[PDB]
From a paper:
A non-turreted virus consisting of a 12-segment [name] genome, mud crab reovirus (MCRV), which may belong to a new order of Reovirales, infects the economically important crab [name]. Like other members of Reovirales, MCRV packages its [name] segments and a number of RNA-dependent RNA polymerase (RdRp) inside a double-layered icosahedral capsid. Using cryo-EM, we determined the structure of mud crab reovirus (MCRV), a 12-segmented [name] virus that is a putative member of Reovirales in the non-turreted Sedoreoviridae family, to near-atomic resolutions with icosahedral symmetry (3.1 Å) and without imposing icosahedral symmetry (3.4 Å). These structures revealed the organization of the major capsid proteins in two layers: an outer T = 13 layer consisting of [name] trimers and unique [name] clamps, and an inner T = 1 layer consisting of [name] dimers.
The map clearly shows an outer and inner capsid layer; the inner capsid layer is a thin shell composed of 60 copies of a [name] dimer, while the outer capsid, arranged on a T = 13 lattice, is thicker and composed of [name] trimers organized in a similar way to the previously reported low-resolution reconstruction. Interdigitating these trimers are two smaller densities per asymmetric unit and assigned to be [name]. A [name] dimer, containing two chemically identical subunits (A and B) with slightly different conformations in an asymmetric unit, forms the thin inner shell of the MCRV. [name], the primary outer shell trimer protein, is comprised of a β-sandwich (two β-sheets of four antiparallel strands) atop an all α-helical base. Two [name] subunits per asymmetric unit are embedded between [name] trimers and bridge multiple asymmetric units. A striking feature of MCRV is the large separation in the inner capsid underneath VP11B at the type III channel.
Residue numbers in the entry:
A (entry chain 1): 1 to 203
B (entry chain B): 253 to 302
C (entry chain j), E (entry chain b), F (entry chain c), G (entry chain h), H (entry chain i): 1 to 274
D (entry chain A): 604 to 804
Write the structure that this text describes.
């Protein structure tokens, strides 16, 4: 019976909130970070954007967090790859339009694999070009070198839920369907068949 | 400051536009003790009567 | 006293010190215009002595500024890790230097070598050790762990690095100068200043209990010297000497302001003139 | 007997006395009214009121309508739309129709979304600004709790649907105070056909 | 005491309890606004403590409530099974539930099996018996005649039915579980609640005398526990728990209110919130 | 009985306690104005008694409040990691302190040292152990695992840390004060209060079954003492005493309000006066 | 299970059965109209459902029908003799016949004659006795004290009065047909219908507990067969077979309806079609 | 029979049961309006047998209902990948309780202990075991694996946990009570109901072949008892007992309706009254 048509309350997203007495203080620090440029996007220059992607291992949900800068990981020993990291970054960027600004609690997807080595590797060897973006890197690396099914399997393995679980949860909340459409995914449903996956370009 | 006072009334103020938040204004509040008028005086009966 | 200090401590401490200074100024101003009357001074302060406004805090009661102090103290000295480190390093907003330390160094903290050749007894601003065996001249006998700055006086059978009577290094090391037999004595007196502020120690004693009653598992009543030594030893390894000064100023100013709100006496200069 | 008896302040006597002096002013009560007003100094209004109160408490029966209203108010609770009122309304951007009523109506305003962030009364929503209103709608369905005065229109598939201005977006999303709803009935004439939600949306 | 309880006791009790609660609420209402002047509180209460709108009561002074309580008590519990037509009883089935019991069970009431096999002594909340002769495991030792609900603590050398430390049946029976020779002793302590309401015991003592000075042939001064044990023993067998609760609530509330109308202190919660 | 307390328990418990308090206030308000008439009290209550203005309730009947209690309890205490998305838990910025505990400490919980030197039994308000071998004065013989606070009465052959008859620490340890031979007996009685609430125990008994019929695999019926001890033992260690009280108040108030909805009697003060 | 049935029981039962049938019909009608969604089925039933147009019962809440059943049951089977008009029930000779009994006879009840000549064992629908001594044909061995009706199958070593396979009498008696030596066994099986109804045993199990928690001094939980036997053995001697069925129909329908109101499943045909 | 129940099975079953109920109600309406004309009943039903207002049924013919039933059954019990997209399985937050089970437990499933000390044989409603070796009293001899509930008819040389003739748990365990050597026999009979629904056994026989012809690799024809045993054994362990009822209701409703649409007879009450 555990299921909800709300994107923020899906099994793969974690709710976080500072201690209930330190909430006013953490608001001032978020404004301090807004004064500096402390926000990563998929449209700004990758040279600038990769300087502000610092995933942190989570041990408790009582942690301060900012909507446009925080990405979370759980303590593990597995190592992610470039494609998994790009898929997770795109997922977390397109999943933040539905973030709840009015409330004191924030929801964030967790990364099953360690992305720190890949982020450091990428940061060591990126030049200051005027046109390269994170979305461009995603399109060149994931869309043009993988099938939709393989990329969906990678994304499912990068969050706790299995492939069948994503396909099932996509039918209940339309927000997840929109999020996956933004990542250039297409789902086709036919009777008596399992779902097939395709990129938006080839459909 | 206005929305945080606690009294018998619920004060509601529409949220300020992001641009109109720095706008400056003057609000003078007096800082003086009023407890020195309420002493015992040889003309207190006059105060009561009037 | 167990506690962890994050890397956002200077930013929290600047706001805390500004709040403490504003409250002290408010108290002094309300104190100089108190006319003796039916209303007591405690009632007089509660009515128009807690109403202080600035960025963030918006309370008009002494309980409000007390809770603001509680929030800042918990966020700075007891909360585990506020944010990823790079978020703090890239802060551009700047802070104001705190006043210089004025606490006299009486019980200076030193550690003996692993050998156990010497025995350490303390006095007022003076460390004297005796030799259980014979030891060669020119080796370390004592080193100072608590930072100290000032002049050096009355050194016997030992040598310290000083020019013109003033110490050169913040952590002086005492070395033997002449060969000596067993059961001798070497002394080293100091006219110096340690970390902390000497004034307002009465308020600290009653404010540390107030903020220990709330954080009972983390903070316990103790002396000012021990409190400051533990706070300095619990600072993060990578921090500039400018930020640690602000952190320590707030760490000592919170208890004195808490105790000053209780006993309605004057505030020390290092809190008032921030 | 529960409240405002002997301890009541003299200020409350104006309300209590009004009914008595209204009763005394009808036809057929002029003798007692004249005697009472002529000798108020010797027999005041308070002692007269207390005497009448004691007379009523001692077994004088109430008018049957008291029990009639008590019995009818229970009927009012159980069937709201017979008296033209609805307990609450749900404002939402992605409605989910209740399939059970599809059997009887071609299209109906009945949904089954689980509300989030209920709002006490319509006035609080109306006084809000649009930016905060749209944030509420995005997070999910929103519920307005206060009672309303609704009317239902039951229409045939052929008839065109009268327009209802539920929300007027003139300067802010303000709810109307009437909230007329439209049902279109399914008959044996048009039961196997499928009607689009075109005109409704 | 000698007293006969008729089949319509719940109907009388449902009116008596309502009258008692009304009087207590009026007492607190008048106690809140006492002027504290030249008049004492007794005169103030005698002047404005009456109920004016209840059918059955014929005076606006407290004496009216007292006389109504006397009539209701005599009709409900005494020899004369007189049905009071003066108060309006419309349905003898409708009965508002009374509050649950709160009296701690200190002196629990138990009866021996009649074999003359055990000795009985009492304590604060436990009973303990000594075997006069040899006894085998699995036979009755004691059983309670006053119903009791609650938990069980410190059960030694005996067995009681329990689920998670809570008693199963309202009349537990104590049976030995081990073959125990040579005049051994077993104990059984209960952290339970008996019948009645512990609060307001001072008013009960002064009110039982008030209502025994009138019905001296049927009622005698005594403690609350014995009064309730006898009152429960006199209940008819054909009586549900929903009705006996109301009967006992009125049986305890009447003396408490009678004594409260003399000593104008507060009223217990179980009387106010009926 | 297995259960995992989630890390946002105080926020859930604040909403749950407010809901329970509102239900109790509505029950008593309807109970005071129920004039005996054609309808019984339960039809009167089940018609206006559920109209409470609060976020999260999707009905105006007691069934809606019952289901809200079920959802909140499941989210807060049970293994289910379901977050109630329709209440105001996400927008909570501050909590209200719960009423102080008033449960008498009759069966106090103690854990013996691993030596096997002593045998422990229980009484109404004390414990006593008998030495098996010679023990020298100055070592632990007992310590309480369940938090307690209050005074100490009738101590023999042992010393407890206290000043003026009031216990110093919330978990006192009992140590021998006189060297004693084997088979010596030592006692310690306490006039103290344990974690929990003493009133409304029948309601708890009839509500624990109600909420165990639904969560059959996770919750089994038991006494209030065992339930509270298990809840306290399952609390995480990183919890302030102010949050733990807020969790425990709801943990005990949910069964009490569930049983209150069945038998429409009064409500305990610690529930209504939240 | 002690109870006193009054002679006016058919008048009360004719109303109770009608109330039960109306409630079941309303439950079915509102059960077919439920669409899965936010509200649980309990809230839906408590709100839109439970509305019946019946005179003498002025409650449209589930609780109101529940206590109407409570009052009618208490009047009909426990209080004793009582006139129906007292509770507003019009007493009329003209009533409706109840549906016929459909309870399958599995454990039929028999009583051995004195002298200990035989020993009885039970089977799914048959009784087998063994002769402890020699017996001659033409004497009673068993007789059913619980009225039975139906066909007879597999009659061995004994004879019963029957024509065409159908038992002629409602209380058949078994008579040995041929003398038997050497401790043989005689078997009598039946395909018959006892007193009661078969459908709805799940609802009865919880309804009997529901109405035993109220009348605990009168009713205890048990199986439907035992309850029917006890109810039948307590009917007044001078009453027709038409009134007995009317009494027993309500006697069985009250528990099953009380259980159906808890678990909102369907209802048996013998309750709906009355 | 291999089958894989997904996690959304209750949601699929809540739609399947409603579809089956609607189809059954259409057939009864068709039967009442047939008119005995030139068209046969099968031809008459084909033109007017389609459900109206039901989403996900594309055709207006019984063929559409058959296709919908096939799709729902395949999704629920056979393959976890397929999930139908045209039915309202989005608003399936809550599910309606199904009718209670009514299948008599004639052949009840038990499992002997690993010892091999007993011999299992079966009868119409009772089981008996013969003892291969001498068995000590007070040990398990049998235990059921298919849940049952109901009274106990006759237990000899064995004891079960029952009160008032009613079984306590749904998995009774038979325990020997008396020492019994030399190949004795113990017999236990039950008047109980197993999981399932008794009526429609013929319709199930016709429908199971239809349902198995399509899924020849997963489903084979068998009796209803074996079907229920396997289906209940294949349910997930960590599932609420309310959802299991819905799953087991649909698992039988589908074959019954499939067989009903071919033989145009009536429908069982447990199918139509959903």
């Amino acid at each position: 019976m555990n299921w909800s048509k709300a994107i923020n309350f899906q099994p793969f997203m974690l709710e976080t909130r500072p201690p209930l007495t330190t909430i006013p203080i953490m608001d001032q620090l978020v404004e301090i970070g807004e004064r500096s440029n402390q926000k990563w996007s998929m449209t700004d220059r990758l040279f600038f954007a990769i300087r502000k992607i610092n995933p942190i291992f989570v041990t408790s949900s009582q942690i301060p967090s900012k909507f446009d800068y925080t990405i979370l990981q759980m303590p593990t020993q597995l190592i992610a790859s470039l494609k998994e990291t790009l898929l997770f970054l795109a997922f977390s960027y397109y999943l933040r339009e539905y973030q709840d600004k009015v409330g004191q609690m924030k929801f964030y997807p967790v990364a099953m694999k360690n992305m720190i080595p890949i982020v450091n590797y990428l940061k060591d060897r990126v030049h200051n070009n005027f046109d390269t973006t994170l979305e461009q890197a995603y399109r060149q690396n994931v869309v043009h070198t993988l099938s939709a099914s393989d990329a969906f399997d990678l994304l499912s393995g990068m969050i706790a839920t299995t492939r069948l679980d994503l396909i099932q949860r996509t039918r209940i909340c339309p927000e997840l369907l929109n999020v996956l459409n933004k990542m250039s995914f297409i789902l086709i449903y036919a009777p008596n068949r399992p779902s097939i996956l395709s990129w938006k370009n080839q459909s | 400051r206005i929305t945080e006072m606690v009294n018998d009334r619920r004060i509601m103020i529409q949220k300020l536009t992001l641009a109109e938040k720095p706008q400056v204004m003057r609000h003078v509040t007096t800082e003086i003790n009023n407890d020195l008028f309420f002493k015992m005086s040889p003309v207190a009966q006059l105060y009561i009567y009037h | 006293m167990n506690l962890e200090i994050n890397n956002f401590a200077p930013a929290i401490s600047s706001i805390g010190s500004q709040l403490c200074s504003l409250s002290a100024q408010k108290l002094l101003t309300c104190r100089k215009q108190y006319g003796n009357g039916a209303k007591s001074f405690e009632e007089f302060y509660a009515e128009i002595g807690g109403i202080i406004g600035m960025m963030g805090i918006n309370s008009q009661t002494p309980s409000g500024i007390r809770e603001a102090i509680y929030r800042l103290y918990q966020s700075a000295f007891l909360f585990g890790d506020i944010f990823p480190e790079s978020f703090g390093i890239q802060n551009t907003q700047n802070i104001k230097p705190p006043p210089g330390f004025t606490a006299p160094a009486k019980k200076l903290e030193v550690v003996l070598p692993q050998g156990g050749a010497f025995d350490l007894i303390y006095n007022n601003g003076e460390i004297r050790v005796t030799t259980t065996r014979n030891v060669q001249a020119g080796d370390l006998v004592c080193t100072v762990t608590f930072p100290i700055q000032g002049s050096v006086i009355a050194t016997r059978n030992c040598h310290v690095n000083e020019i013109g009577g003033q110490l050169t290094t913040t952590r002086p090391e005492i070395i033997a100068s002449v060969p000596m037999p067993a059961r001798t004595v070497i002394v080293a007196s100091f006219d110096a200043i340690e970390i902390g502020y000497g004034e307002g120690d009465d308020l600290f004693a009653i404010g540390i209990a107030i903020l220990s009653n709330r954080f009972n598992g983390q903070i316990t009543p103790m002396s000012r010297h021990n409190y400051m030594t533990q706070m300095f030893a619990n600072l993060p390894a990578n921090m500039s000497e400018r930020d640690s000064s602000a952190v320590l100023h707030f760490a000592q100013a919170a208890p004195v302001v808490l105790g000053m709100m209780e006993r309605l006496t004057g505030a020390p200069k290092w809190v008032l003139d921030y | 007997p529960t409240r405002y008896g002997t301890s009541e302040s003299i200020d409350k006597f104006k309300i209590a006395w009004e009914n008595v002096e209204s009763v005394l002013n009808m036809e057929g009560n002029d003798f007692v009214k004249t005697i009472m007003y002529a000798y108020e100094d010797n027999f005041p209004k308070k002692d007269f009121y207390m005497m009448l109160k004691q007379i009523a408490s001692d077994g004088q029966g109430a008018h049957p309508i008291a029990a009639a209203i008590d019995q009818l108010r229970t009927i009012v609770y159980r069937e709201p739309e017979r008296f033209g009122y609805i307990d609450s309304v749900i404002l939402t951007h992605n409605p989910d129709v209740d399939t059970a009523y599809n059997r009887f109506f071609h299209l109906h305003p009945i949904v089954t979304n689980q509300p989030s962030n209920t709002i006490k009364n319509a006035q609080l929503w109306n006084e809000m600004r649009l930016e905060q209103q749209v944030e509420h709608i995005k997070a999910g369905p929103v519920r307005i709790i206060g009672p309303f005065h609704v009317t239902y229109n039951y229409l045939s598939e052929e008839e065109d649907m009268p327009a209802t201005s539920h929300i007027i977006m003139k300067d802010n999303m303000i709810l109307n105070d009437h909230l007329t709803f439209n049902f279109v009935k399914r008959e044996r004439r048009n039961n196997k056909k499928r009607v689009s939600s075109f005109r409704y949306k």
